[PDB]
Write a protein that binds this ligand. Structure first.
Ligand code: HEM
Ligand code: HEM
Ligand SMILES: O[C@@H](c1cn(-c2ccc3[nH]ccc3c2)nn1)c1c(C2CC2)sc2cncn12
Ligand SMILES: O[C@@H](c1cn(-c2ccc3[nH]ccc3c2)nn1)c1c(C2CC2)sc2cncn12
Lengths: 372, 385
């Protein structure tokens, strides 16, 4: 089994298991702002409340779960401060009373000082009833940006698909041990088990229609997910007052920072990060925005022999069929995702085109990996 | 690799799966000089680039080739030689005499097998540091040692291009630095086991290897001349990523639809220098252009060597360990490694002034800033000035 040092959970996988809901009393001033973003943004009192804060030390965040909650809290406040109401007026400087401890905590956790997928998706959740299962009805997010932003639906549906895909992670050690031991039948059962997990993850995906609406996603949520890397609104980046002299550019929160999807492309030999193209460059850059243990996990998978090369080298139709079942399940997920992105991004934009090409290039690379 | 999946990142030994040699390190040990007779048509062109470019017959000889299958390259060394052969021909075809006329399309009879072999080896279809430096060499006498006098390159671009000097001197510095690679497992085991004296001897041994590598560097003056390097060799090292001569990249006829952009051969693709920055916690790859360039150049390294660098990043921080000890001796040994890197990079800046900066001014920079930023990042990693 996968070492504890990789921080992969048996149940939720790359998601943070049982995230912390509240910070120690020393940080109640941060917690008040973060828990009241919809009202403080709408009223215009948010930027003032941030500017009125006293610079706190990160020294009172003892455990990893408190450090991860503080990252989500500070990250949500930073996005809200920079974008405000999201109708034009951008703040180009992050005050030192928040930027200093944000960059300090970010340096400790080896993550950039910007809200990432690991903050608003992997750590932004809770069970309503701990005795009930991990289903949409029994879950909620810790923070939202605005009322009606569909943040709960967007984040929880991504999280539920992450957990659905995570069921195949435990099969990875079996795949590599079966190749080493030359256990052909074991590798076939293992590849077929991974395919069924990825097929089950596509069924989970269907919930996106019931908890997100195109208008709220396109006109509201999108604003707060935006970063400052190649953005004309902050052409040189953001100033992290009292930490850096020059403004630093960081990419916004992306599902391209999800370790589960990157790990199945690595596992199946789908060279998503190879080729020198924009899609490959983006996905490689997004690894720097993943928790360090999860970034280490992906590299360890790349250090292991190629499952695709092994299957190609065997002249075994059954083994090729099992390998192709995994690849087909990934093409199916990415093809369904493209239809969702057409409904939620492409069509609302007409009532953008680059995101379609990025997803189509990623999907095409997966399709071209089929042995047949 | 399976053990690291079950017990976590731990580099107690350098596995053979990383393709690092005990003697030449990241360089390809004993590279193949000749391809099977099936590829003599490629070999003729590659071995005669100076004469074929100068005569004007080169582009014609490439266009006259029949598309050969990569199926007759069985071993890894033949595949690496074919990459160097095809890569050298591609650079010569694209640039020609290098005085204006560029070819924006690579013919399919060469581009198809080049991209096929490149896809197998997980490297881009452009000449990389691993081709013209790590695989472009041979021992004149196998019984004599790895010294400049007993070595030669397999391919050159033009007569008097100083390719032998530029490539072999880079290679000899690579091998000099490689002697410290075997000390890496000792460093990680000493930190795990809390063996303070062992870690001190290990850090001092790495420093002496990096100090010996600066002495090796001095040979650059005797085998390279500024005029030949600036007016000739530079042309053939140029790539097609952000180049105004091939603004959209190169067309790899019969392999890709759109023209693909790839960066030219760079010493920023050297795994030995990147691995000592990773080992010493010099965050060379951590938002600026210099950091982005060095991270991108990892995609141009052999896959096993790219995996080696990420495995080093997965292991605990030697810098954090040394900082946390309040031990002047351990800090002095750590600083000896960092100082040896600052010394190398400072001597290199003087070489780049002599070979690039001054020749550029004697005619009717961004690379200076890149090197200065890399050197500054190394200097700022010193615990005590
Ligand atoms: C409202 C529905 C959704 C929309 C509009 C949407 C949109 C997008 C966009 C625009 C990208 C491109 C990267 C970027 O610009 O950040 C992307 C990438 C991606 N999305 Fe979604 N997404 C949706 C739902 C989901 C869900 C539920 C998941 C499940 C985890 C998911 C997983 C991914 C993955 C893994 C990528 C990276 C590329 C790939 O591996 O195919 N998406 N998505
Ligand atoms: C004729 C002498 C030399 C010149 C003019 C020269 C020039 C350059 C240039 C222009 C770069 C910037 C990157 C690029 O544009 O691709 C560079 C980087 C570099 N060069 Fe050289 N070089 C010389 C000799 C050497 C030798 C002998 C080595 C030994 C291995 C070496 C090692 C490096 C390294 C490691 C880098 C990456 C940046 C760094 O880590 O400091 N150079 N060089
Ligand atoms: O990649 C993120 C994203 C950016 N945009 C976006 C970016 C640019 C845009 N332009 C016009 C619409 C639009 C939407 N949507 N989603 C994302 C998530 C974030 C929590 C981190 S969760 C998820 C699942 N599939 C994608 N994502
Ligand atoms: O990075 C490569 C390079 C580019 N240029 C260059 C780049 C821009 C220029 N502008 C005017 C002259 C000129 C030369 N020199 N060297 C390089 C090597 C390549 C074989 C792989 S070997 C080596 C050691 N130090 C650097 N290098």
């Amino acid at each position: 089994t996968i070492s504890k040092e990789y921080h992969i959970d048996e149940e939720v996988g790359f998601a943070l298991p049982n995230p912390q809901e509240n910070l120690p009393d020393f940080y109640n001033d941060w917690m008040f702002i973060a828990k009241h973003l919809p009202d403080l943004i709408e009223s215009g009192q948010l930027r003032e409340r941030v500017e009125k804060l006293n610079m706190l030390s990160i020294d009172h965040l003892t455990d990893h779960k408190s450090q991860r909650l503080a990252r989500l809290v500070l990250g949500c406040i930073t996005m809200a401060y920079v974008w405000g109401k999201g109708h034009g007026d951008v703040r180009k400087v992050l005050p030192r009373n928040i930027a200093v401890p944000y960059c300090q905590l970010s340096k400790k956790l080896e993550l950039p000082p910007i809200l990432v997928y690991a903050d608003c998706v992997l750590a932004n959740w809770k069970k309503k009833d701990p005795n009930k299962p991990l289903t949409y009805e029994n879950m909620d997010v810790l923070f939202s940006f605005r009322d009606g932003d569909c943040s709960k639906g967007f984040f929880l549906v991504s999280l539920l698909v992450e957990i659905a895909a995570a069921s195949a992670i435990k099969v990875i050690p079996t795949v590599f041990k079966a190749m080493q031991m030359q256990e052909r039948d074991t590798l076939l059962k293992a590849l077929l088990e991974i395919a069924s997990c990825l097929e089950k993850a596509l069924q989970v995906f269907h919930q996106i229609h019931d908890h997100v609406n195109p208008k709220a996603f396109f006109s509201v949520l999108r604003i707060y997910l935006s970063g400052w890397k190649g953005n004309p609104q902050l052409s040189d980046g953001l100033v992290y007052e009292g930490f850096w002299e020059d403004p630093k550019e960081f990419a916004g929160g992306s599902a391209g920072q999800s370790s589960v999807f990157q790990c199945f492309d690595v596992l199946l030999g789908i060279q998503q990060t190879a080729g020198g193209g924009h899609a490959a460059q983006f996905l490689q850059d997004m690894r720097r925005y993943m928790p360090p243990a999860h970034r280490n996990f992906l590299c360890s998978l790349e250090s292991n022999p190629s499952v695709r090369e092994f299957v190609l080298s065997k002249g075994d139709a059954g083994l090729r069929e099992a390998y192709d079942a995994c690849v087909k399940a990934l093409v199916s997920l990415r093809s369904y995702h493209l239809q969702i992105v057409t409904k939620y991004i492409l069509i609302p934009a007409s009532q953008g085109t680059d995101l379609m090409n990025f997803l189509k290039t990623v999907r095409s690379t997966t399709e071209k990996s089929l042995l047949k």
